[PDB]
């Protein structure tokens, strides 16, 4: 299941130094996202001294471990707007009409492509770090999103009642 269905895309690939007394030691950080495009996604991180390949390797395993189900509306978009603050990134994301593109920041684009979020429009305010953007994106996707079924049951209402009325 895991290899054939999950798709891996590197999001961050960089060199971070830890200057020790003898000299500058340089290691490789990699941040990746694995998603089946069908409502399951996860993020992974890896750190390797000798070659980035090992960093991406451990990142792939870590992403596989943290693979989690993601709420989705019609299997194409978020249930409602998500306004989320994560360690200095402000993500404002909006659900969209069918056929709407992924008109978002690129990091969010790969995350949505991996997780099967077809439709979204969003803006990133305050800091624009890709690392924090990705972490906050997944967190706001899973914590900050509530399914209409769950909302209705928590309110003890039928889906017909909670569903919005059509106006024109």
């Amino acid at each position: 299941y895991i290899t054939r269905k999950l798709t891996m895309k590197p999001l961050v690939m960089k060199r971070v130094s830890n200057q020790t007394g003898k000299g500058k030691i340089a290691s490789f950080y990699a941040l990746v996202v694995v998603g089946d495009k069908n409502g399951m996604v996860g993020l992974g991180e890896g750190k390797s001294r000798e070659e980035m390949s090992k960093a991406i390797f451990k990142a792939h395993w870590d992403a596989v471990r943290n693979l989690k189900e993601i709420p989705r509306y019609e299997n194409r978009t978020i249930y409602g707007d998500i306004d989320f603050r994560y360690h200095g990134v402000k993500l404002h994301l909006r659900s969209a009409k069918p056929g709407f593109g992924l008109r978002v920041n690129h990091v969010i684009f790969e995350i949505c492509e991996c997780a099967g979020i077809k439709d979204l429009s969003g803006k990133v305010y305050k800091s624009r770090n890709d690392m924090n953007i990705a972490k906050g994106t997944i967190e706001a996707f899973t914590k900050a999103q509530k399914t209409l079924d769950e909302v209705a049951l928590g309110r003890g209402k039928k889906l017909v009642d909670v569903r919005k009325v059509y106006y024109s």
Binding site: A152, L153, R155, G156, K157, K158, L159
Partner: protein
């Protein structure tokens, strides 16, 4: 007592007369029990909105007026009648939240609400099997603890089970439950009948035949799909319950009074279903 009899005769004018009389001439306003009786009145007249308004007022006025498990059971009955399972579940959560203690009737009424809600995909919101399953789980939670029983609850329990059996199209369970109920009713009446059995056989059978059981059995027949699999088949507690009831029905048939059930545990064809439908009708 006035409101009790007025409900039993469903006289709206008598309700108005008694309530207005007491308030005007006696300074007496309904307490929690009288307001619960008023809710039962509104339920009798199928006036759900007024019943919910009264329930809200019982919560609002004071803690003495605050609903208890009896009023909550009545409200669960209203939820059954409206086939409103999310509200029934939310109410059950409220009884747990307010520390009110459930009773046998609470579990039975929840099971009936879920059984009725699971009738169609439209009313069940596409969770019909899940709702029947949850009703069965509530019946199991009943079976765990003694709670407080009521002389009538036993009957309702059977009906509740049959409801979950009837809406799932489980012919064999419906047949088993129908046979066991009719047999126990007939034997209990005949054992406790003052007159001779033979002369009063008409009255005995009229007492024995409860139309609700017949209607639920025929609903079990109508929803027959050969490819269907019962919800109670999957679970271990469920399969054990099914096995126990089917074994009891089989043994009872193997061992007076007779019913025209065909000599088979299950009906596997439409033709046999039609034959038994005509037989019981």
């Amino acid at each position: 007592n006035c409101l009790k009899y007025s409900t039993k005769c469903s006289s709206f004018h008598d309700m108005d007369y008694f309530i207005t009389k007491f308030r005007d001439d006696y300074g007496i306003t309904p307490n929690k029990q009288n307001l619960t009786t008023v809710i039962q009145f509104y339920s009798r007249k199928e006036m759900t909105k007024q019943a919910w308004n009264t329930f809200d007022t019982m919560k609002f006025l004071s803690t003495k007026h605050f609903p208890d498990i009896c009023t909550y059971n009545t409200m669960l009955r209203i939820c059954e009648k409206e086939r409103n399972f999310p509200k029934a579940l939310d109410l059950f959560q409220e009884i747990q939240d307010h520390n009110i203690k459930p009773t046998t009737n609470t579990y039975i009424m929840m099971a009936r609400v879920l059984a009725s809600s699971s009738s169609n995909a439209v009313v069940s919101e596409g969770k019909s099997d899940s709702l029947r399953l949850l009703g069965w789980k509530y019946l199991h939670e009943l079976e765990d603890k003694n709670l407080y029983r009521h002389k009538k609850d036993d009957l309702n329990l059977f009906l509740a089970m049959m409801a979950l059996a009837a809406f799932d199209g489980d012919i064999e369970l419906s047949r088993a439950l129908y046979y066991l109920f009719i047999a126990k009713k007939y034997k209990t009446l005949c054992a406790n009948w003052k007159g001779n059995i033979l002369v009063d056989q008409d009255t005995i059978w009229k007492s024995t035949l409860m139309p609700e059981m017949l209607n639920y059995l025929m609903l079990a027949y109508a929803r027959f799909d050969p490819r269907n699999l019962p919800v109670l088949s999957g679970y271990e507690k469920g399969i054990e319950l099914r096995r126990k009831f089917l074994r009891e029905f089989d043994s009872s048939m193997r061992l007076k009074f007779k019913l025209p059930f065909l000599p088979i545990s299950d009906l596997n064809s439409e033709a046999q279903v039609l034959a038994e439908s005509n037989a019981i009708w």
